Amino acid sequence: NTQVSKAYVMKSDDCLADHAEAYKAHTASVQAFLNITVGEHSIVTTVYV
Amino acid sequence: NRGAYVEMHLPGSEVDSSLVSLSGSSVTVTPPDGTSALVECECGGTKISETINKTKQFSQCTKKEQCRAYRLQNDKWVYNSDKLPKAAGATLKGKLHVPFLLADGK
């Protein structure tokens, strides 16, 4: 008598919420959140560096 | 119903040795009420008698051990488990959503 069995690998049902993600990171960009006070005039700004 | 799913499949025939009995020193298959039972026998002349619904007496086979009765359901689908025999042909019949999925909280 014969029995055929096969198996395979698939994503887990929780992969939508529990997954690590692998990135390639390069060319960082710097920003600053500065309080600037000039001549009694104050402002809060975001400045690209 | 979130993203996840599993597959519900057409079940395979489940052998039942209670159907086969020895009535008059000859085998007799009594399928359950309103259910087919394919009878496969290997005595003199192979028996492939599928469409029996009420009762069938086989006198060719004199022993219960040389006949096998398989219950046929073919109406309610089952999970694609590995501890169940596979039905012939295409079996994929639908998708069952997976409850209690992992979720974010505090």
Ligand SMILES: *[C@@H]1O[C@H](CO)[C@@H](O)[C@H](O)[C@H]1NC(C)=O
């Ligand atoms: C900078 O500005 C923020 C804006 O509300 C303020 O909360 C903070 O106190 C300021 N910092 C200084 C040193 O004044």
